[PDB]
Design a protein around this ligand. Structure first.
Ligand SMILES: [Fe+3]
Ligand SMILES: [Fe+3]
Ligand SMILES: [Fe+3]
Lengths: 389, 167, 136, 515, 389, 140, 136
């Protein structure tokens, strides 16, 4: 070959001997803990903190930064690479957030890969089982195909709301939390379409194209409030804290949890759908992992920041007021879908829907509203939604 | 000059004392605008506190932001600048000014001044970022048109530098 | 073929001879090339693909291919395009092997590279401009 | 019916889902990017790699298992972490932590591009890159984490996210691989990051370096870096797809070649001298001359296969290319003078070229011995390595009129009285502040865009302070609180302390005071 | 340290130089395909075949063996280590079986590990979701806890039936098929008990002990026919082909599939059980993977062996007659459970149970009975079971 | 009720399941080993390693990934397969293939012991060994 | 301590001196030992456990421990028992680490070894005979 075949210093006798002569017989320092100066959140420094913390090169004029001076190159006009102008919220240290699941990149893809491969094994067995035969064909072709299919656009819209968050946010652990939350949302959208494509292989003339779901998302009154909230959260604001809080802690925690768990998953297990709960098992698992990290960022940290907690709750309560109204509106449109399904006592009758809304709103009050001082009357929100029943 | 340490020094400590005496949104808004006109951008009036102004600027924003949440009604936080102007009106005004600019040197000055006067917490973040993006789009189209046309000797005179040395 | 060697052309000169050609006026603008460069990370699977696909069938269909040993990786340069079918690699290896498994040890592409079906292609063509990308 | 159905085993393959991605976006009047840009990306752009989220994870986890197997099982059992030549184990402190900031900022840059694009498939290609760059941040971190545990000098491997802030070389890295990726027109950033940064310069920085690593005994870096670049190639496709998506925009005819030439000069200004310095001076065993590596990867292959082939769509050979070629031959030797002279501000231990290195330099860069080699050998005789010498070469440069300036745009140091690469000193006063610029391309950028380039330089920040106090304040010390991390030799004894630095009496001046 | 620190020949300069001088500059043979002489079942030799085939050291007097002579040590009395006396069935080559999923040990544990870890993530999210709140508490505490809990003893009994199979069977691919099938059965038993322990953490005073399930398995008439068949398959026979065929192709394919899929999984999705289908998703996936391998061994190979197919079908049809009668009996006892649940039309009424039995028996006829020439009247078996309704 | 429940995140750890294994066996008169033996194994024997099927797989797959990483990635890239002294590379033909038959026959032997034991926990320890010996056949 | 070295006792003799002791009549029956032998496969995790648990806290509680480097593995012999808590190993390593993860690189036990909770124990005691095994 035209070029030298390079001898390896690890195994070549000559080069290994030269290298051995140059290496000292003793260590030159005894501190072997990588970035030993990070303050640990738990009893001892974790690998997640070691590999993540301070990768963002913030200067001292962004709260928590270790570097100094201005950026080397800014936007035309002077916008800084990162800057305090990116959000209303304030903190003594932007690096204080910790994902409680401690996900750096490797555990994240390791877990999703398990779900990736197991899903295909489950589908091959489910097709061989013939279990599709017991699904109510009205639920299948009318509710599932059309209205579950349209829900992918909510997930996809929430995914896209993270694009400016991923560019604008101000530390490394926050950025990892946001990007993983975004991928899980687009995963949810792709899984809903995977289910529809799967059903198309088993039921002839089942149409898995997105044409009808897209028409329903964009023009059906049942999704009109949801589409409006999602378009606003995605393209109407750029404060990256507002997007994460509105997206996950209000809209997805109220409308999203109702649509995924109280409607499509719960009623799958009254109309004999043995397939859909396999997919909602994933979206709901992703929802609870995301919630742990959003909770740490907003509830545990920013709402209690030693200098800015009350300042921050002022904005959080304002945002919550505005986006909770949008989400109530979205749920009030959505519950019209119940007119399209068979009335089952305690599930799809008014008492059933009322209990389901008490679960979503009552959970949200404990999980989020109580912890930032937001006052909410659960019963009053339940009644506002039932107005659309 | 003999610089003091980077992160803790007498310049930053003195300005933190001044900042701690701001007590009203009106007073802090004038303070932060005067500071930004005086000490930021290539058209600042003084480079005296060059290595410290960005940290000092952060501390002024912290004080103004807290004062805002303590003294203003919530609706004002969303829709108004702390000057009292309507945030949407500030937005429309400055986009109009930049689109009426005839050279890159007029455009560049409008954008820089908008940031000096209205950078958060003066304007609400969502309105400010949207306006600044619109201004920057215009500035780039002007500047990047025929970028290599003027020779350096010409650009030096247009910019107004005092040439102290050319090797 | 020899035009695709790592040390082709100017690279064989040393010292002043190298400098004079490097600074020649003809060589101050880029020269369009119809080549592609493919870098494969060394591993058990890749070393079998190199020996039994790239250097047999591959070189038969494209005699311009040159493969060079760069210790940790294989450096491959060819005229026009290189193509590797993951389905053929799987048969050679005796284990499931998708195009995504092939990508586990494909380390660099100087060229337009894409996946379609089981096939990985790196081509001189300006995909998306001169020739459209397609679905399965 | 409820009794008959086809029961053959079927699944759904990734490319079946991917086919429907383009239809996931939907139209509303507010659906447009939030970021300033002169260009409009076409709605129908398709992507070259058909990846969905589940198959993304499956593919990346399989890369990880093999890599972490080799590192944590096989190479640890062999003791590989301390079988590296000291010059190279020191060089990897810089290579891996500096690359880390590029990996990190590329997360934010790709997210900004995801925002710019209108086509769901194009968003998806940028989205995959967002995830890869998180992977690569953690991979670079893991190299230094692994070296902290297993190599004979963990200082500097174990704390560079803070000790990099002391020195001047870090500033230049922030321009090409941090600010340059995220601050500007989304398309300017795309050419800086993907078309030049990744498609051109990571081939030498990430791929070709592994042969230098192996030559010097390091099998840790190839294990990781060769896996990093498996993702990188999908980012080269992203940059190309950017160009495709704006090819029918009349704005591209107006603007693209200006953004491309600015980005090409930005990237090359730092990497051409810095990589050649780190490869040739930071190694014992050399693979080939840096200028040959640059020729193969930058000029001939990247220039011919990417830029040359795009000529039919209006892309020109960059006007700054001729100046870049002069740098490829000499500028890394120029930078070596500055790097060795300012060694106490770093976080790695250096070694002057030995007698056989010098023979190699002169053979491959005729004239090296009479210019650079004469200086290095004089410094050696003056006591460069000896902590009792009181000698630090930065003051020897000053005493002989060889002042060092920092380019206000690129942050690259420049020694006009000694430099053989491209450039010349321009010193301007503007509105009461003095600025040093060093080449025609950067001077234009500053003259047209002065509010983009206000970056404080080390002389402005450290003016009048004594070297040892700056190092102490920056934590540039080992765990005993007094021995410097940085050293002017790679031996295990006679290490310099703060008191040996203080004895030299080095105080930072203002280099522009004389003008 | 007291002993020499051994120098590595890979990296020590002296030893590496000596080793390099001794290695020839050329290969000494060109055949690099490990056990290149195995006849491939598919287009090219697979790694699964390479690593598995002929590990069993059979002599030529066991059909297919490559070795010669008697065993070195036999049982007291003369029973051979392996021998033709172990089964009634005969074949020209015992090494002819191939698992269609090509599982050697590594892909097997790789896949189950994905299910292991994902299960714990799903449980942590399901507990955080509060989804237990929507489960009918009668289904939960009465049917699920007691009767689903008792089904673990069927799975555990079928697991134990494989102990003598694992000792006695006559080739390496058959042994791998049998051992993996056994572990999946005991996995099913442990997963049912995992679900009960999980519910106990969420519902106070839910008793997850096995005491009641064990009493139901051993003494409740609903399981009396099932327990008798399983005790017979496990401890009443030792022909290892009879055990695999009776266990998987008759009993588990009829009673087992009815109990797991048509009763507990299907009715979970009428009484609002969102938890149980996650676990039955696993047992049913394991059932279909096991079926692929049993099918190859018995249906594709032994029933068509060029010299012994008809001979082998004679025994297979006899076994099927006997064990299908036992399984019909077992189902007739089992359908008494329907008297304990609320009557839902098309599910738990006579028409519903009749359609479910038509699915199990009709599937079994296509999957198994038709392929060995066994004549069965589906309708007649449905009616025999309904006799117990 | 249908509104209140404890919502703390919980799972079920392997040793919690393993605790119930002993009670999986049940008594009937034909429940005895099929194999000739002079001895009777006690019904109450416990096992030293508390392994269940799911955690068995998780543990073994993690061993495999690191091993196959070292072999297929790192040592292949180093060319290690031909850096062995010829005497030893020849000896390994015998050592690994002869050991293989022990690994293989141990599958059947442990299954016979699983049959002999009466205690479910003791059966479980032999069962884990049955699976390991398949692993080791494939490793040799 | 020195009684637990790999080369303790007869193992230091060579040649005829070794043979005469090896064939001495006292040495034709086994001699009961209160020792345990633990073999740890070398890896990143194990090497940290060796240095920061076994050779610090471990040797402090049991001064009889001897650790020897056998190239690919660590050979450990102690009087009585050795104990390793996976929960302490996880804190040292900074990542999740159960007792089952610890077993990934535990390669041999000459002694009675068992798992209980997060603890791996290898003991001279006759577990199940002299002392009962328990559940959590
Ligand atoms: Fe990267
Ligand atoms: Fe990249
Ligand atoms: Fe074994």
């Amino acid at each position: 070959q035209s070029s030298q075949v390079t001898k390896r210093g690890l195994t070549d006798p000559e080069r290994a001997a030269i290298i051995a002569a140059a290496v000292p017989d003793h260590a030159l320092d005894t501190q072997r803990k990588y970035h030993y100066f990070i303050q640990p959140r738990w009893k001892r420094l974790s690998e997640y903190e070691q590999l993540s913390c301070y990768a963002q090169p913030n200067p001292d004029w962004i709260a928590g930064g270790l570097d100094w001076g201005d950026w080397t190159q800014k936007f035309h006009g002077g916008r800084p690479s990162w800057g305090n102008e990116s959000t209303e919220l304030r903190t003594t240290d932007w690096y204080r957030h910790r994902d409680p699941a401690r996900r750096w990149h490797h555990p994240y893809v390791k877990d999703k890969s398990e779900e990736a491969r197991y899903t295909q094994r489950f589908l091959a067995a489910y097709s061989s089982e013939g279990s599709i035969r017991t699904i109510d064909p009205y639920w299948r072709d009318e509710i599932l195909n059309k209205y579950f299919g349209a829900l992918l656009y909510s997930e996809y819209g929430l995914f896209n709301a993270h694009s400016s968050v991923g560019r604008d946010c101000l530390s490394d652990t926050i950025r990892q939390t946001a990007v993983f939350a975004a991928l899980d949302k687009v995963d949810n959208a792709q899984m809903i379409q995977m289910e529809r494509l799967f059903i198309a292989k088993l039921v002839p003339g089942f149409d898995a194209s997105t044409d009808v779901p897209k028409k329903i998302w964009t023009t059906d009154p049942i999704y009109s409030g949801a589409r409006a909230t999602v378009q606003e959260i995605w393209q109407g604001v750029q404060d990256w804290n507002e997007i994460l809080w509105a997206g996950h802690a209000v809209y997805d925690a109220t409308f999203g949890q109702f649509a995924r768990r109280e409607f499509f998953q719960r009623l799958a297990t009254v109309y004999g759908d043995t397939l859909t709960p396999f997919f909602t098992a994933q979206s709901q698992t992703y929802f609870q992992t995301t919630r742990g990290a959003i909770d740490d960022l907003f509830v545990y940290c920013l709402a209690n920041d030693s200098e800015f907690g009350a300042h921050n709750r002022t904005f959080l309560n304002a945002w919550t007021e505005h986006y909770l109204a949008s989400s109530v509106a979205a749920l009030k449109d959505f519950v019209g879908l119940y007119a399209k399904v068979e009335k089952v006592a305690g599930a799809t009758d008014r008492a059933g829907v009322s209990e389901a809304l008490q679960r979503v709103f009552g959970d949200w009050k404990i999980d989020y509203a109580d912890k930032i001082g937001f006052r909410v009357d659960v019963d009053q929100k339940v009644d506002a939604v039932l107005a659309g029943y | 000059a003999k610089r003091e340490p980077i992160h803790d020094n007498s310049i930053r400590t003195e300005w933190e004392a001044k900042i701690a005496k701001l007590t009203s949104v009106d007073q802090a808004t004038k303070f932060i605008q005067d500071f930004r006109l005086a000490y930021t951008s290539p058209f600042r009036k003084s480079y005296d506190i060059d290595v410290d102004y960005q940290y000092i600027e952060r501390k002024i924003e912290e004080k103004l932001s807290v004062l805002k949440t303590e003294k203003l009604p919530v609706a004002d936080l969303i829709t108004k600048a702390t000057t009292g102007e309507d945030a949407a009106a500030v937005e429309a005004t400055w986009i109009a000014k930049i689109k009426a600019a005839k050279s890159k040197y007029e455009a560049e000055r409008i954008h820089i001044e908008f940031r000096q006067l209205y950078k958060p917490p003066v304007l609400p973040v969502n309105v400010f970022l949207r306006t600044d993006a619109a201004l920057g789009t215009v500035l780039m189209e002007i500047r990047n048109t025929d970028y290599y046309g003027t020779p350096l000797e010409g650009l030096r005179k247009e910019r107004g530098v005092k040439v102290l040395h050319l090797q | 073929s020899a035009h695709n060697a790592y040390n082709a052309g100017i690279m064989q000169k040393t010292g002043k001879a190298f400098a004079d050609e490097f600074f020649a006026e003809e060589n101050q603008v880029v020269h369009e090339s119809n080549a592609v460069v493919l870098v494969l990370m060394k591993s058990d699977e890749i070393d079998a693909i190199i020996e039994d696909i790239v250097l047999k069938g591959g070189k038969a269909k494209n005699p311009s291919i040159v493969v060079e040993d760069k210790a940790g990786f294989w450096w491959i340069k060819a005229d026009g395009a290189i193509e590797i079918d993951a389905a053929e690699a799987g048969e050679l290896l005796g284990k499931p092997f998708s195009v995504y498994d092939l990508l586990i040890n494909v380390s660099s592409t100087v060229g337009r590279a894409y996946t379609l079906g089981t096939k990985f292609t790196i081509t001189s063509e300006l995909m998306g401009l001169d020739r459209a990308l397609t679905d399965i | 019916d409820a009794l008959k159905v086809n029961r053959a085993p079927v699944g759904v393959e990734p490319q079946e889902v991917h086919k429907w991605l383009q239809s996931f976006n939907w139209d509303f009047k507010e659906n447009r990017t939030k970021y300033p840009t002169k260009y409009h990306m076409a709605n129908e752009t398709k992507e070259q790699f058909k990846v969905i989220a589940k198959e993304y994870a499956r593919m990346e986890a399989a890369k990880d298992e093999r890599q972490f197997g080799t590192l944590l099982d096989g190479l640890t059992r062999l003791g590989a972490g301390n079988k590296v030549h000291p010059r190279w184990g020191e060089t990897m402190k810089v290579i891996s932590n500096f690359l880390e900031v590029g990996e990190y900022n590329a997360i934010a840059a790709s997210a900004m591009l995801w925002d710019s694009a209108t086509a769901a498939e194009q968003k998806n290609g940028y989205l995959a890159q967002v995830l890869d760059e998180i992977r690569h941040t953690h991979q670079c971190a893991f190299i230094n984490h692994y070296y902290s545990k297993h190599y004979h000098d963990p200082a500097g491997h174990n704390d560079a996210r803070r000790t990099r802030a002391i020195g001047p070389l870090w500033k230049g890295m922030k321009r090409v691989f941090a600010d340059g990726f995220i601050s500007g027109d989304a398309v300017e950033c795309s050419v800086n990051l993907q078309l030049v940064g990744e498609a051109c310069f990571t081939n030498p920085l990430i791929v070709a370096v592994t042969e230098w690593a192996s030559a010097n005994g390091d099998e840790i870096t190839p294990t990781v870096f060769l896996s990093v670049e498996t993702d990188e190639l999908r980012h080269m496709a992203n940059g190309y797809q950017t160009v495709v998506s704006i090819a029918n925009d009349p704005a591209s005819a107006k603007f693209l070649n200006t953004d491309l030439n600015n980005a090409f000069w930005t990237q090359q200004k730092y990497f051409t001298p810095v990589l050649g310095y780190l490869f040739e001076y930071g190694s014992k065993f050399k693979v080939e001359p840096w200028v040959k590596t640059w020729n193969r990867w930058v000029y001939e292959d990247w220039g011919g296969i990417w830029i040359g082939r795009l000529g039919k769509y209006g892309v020109e050979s960059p006007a700054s290319l001729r100046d870049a070629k002069r740098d490829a031959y000499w500028a890394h030797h120029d930078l070596a003078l500055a790097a060795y002279a300012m060694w106490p501000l770093g976080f790695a231990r250096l070694a002057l070229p030995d007698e056989e290195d010098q023979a190699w330099f002169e053979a491959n860069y005729p004239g090296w011995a009479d210019h650079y080699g004469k200086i290095f050998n004089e410094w050696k005789k003056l006591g460069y390595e000896d902590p009792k010498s009181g000698f630090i070469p930065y003051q020897w440069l000053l005493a002989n009129g060889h002042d060092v300036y920092i380019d206000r745009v690129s942050q690259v140091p420049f020694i006009p009285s000694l430099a053989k690469g491209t450039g010349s000193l321009r010193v301007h006063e503007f509105n009461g502040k003095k600025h040093s610029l060093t080449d025609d391309w950067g001077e234009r950028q500053w003259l047209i865009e002065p509010e983009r380039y206000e970056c404080h330089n080390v002389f402005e920040q450290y003016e009048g302070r004594e070297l040892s106090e700056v190092i102490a304040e920056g934590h540039g010390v080992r765990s005993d609180g007094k021995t410097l991390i940085a050293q002017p030799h790679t031996r295990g004894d006679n290490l310099w302390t703060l008191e040996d630095i203080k004895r030299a009496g080095c105080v930072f001046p203002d280099p522009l005071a004389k003008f």
